[PDB]
């Protein structure tokens, strides 16, 4: 299952496959700039 890891088909979610920093940017900036719709969170 390395293929469905680095396309984020069925694997880790957004909150923890980003950096410890980019999640901070995307959770602080969500009222004017939204870096939440780009990335994929798999289910």
């Amino acid at each position: 299952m390395p293929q469905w890891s680095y396309m984020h088909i069925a694997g880790q979610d957004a909150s923890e496959y980003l950096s410890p920093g980019l999640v901070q940017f995307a959770r602080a900036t969500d009222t004017y700039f939204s870096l939440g719709n780009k990335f994929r969170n798999p289910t």
């Binding site: 694997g11 880790q12 979610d13 923890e16 969170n41 798999p42 289910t43």
Partner: peptide, 16 residues
């Protein structure tokens, strides 16, 4: 953690 076999995300997420 004692009945996790539900819609999941990376954590048993859909547990509510």
């Amino acid at each position: 953690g004692s009945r996790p076999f539900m819609g999941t995300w990376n954590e048993i997420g859909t547990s509510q």
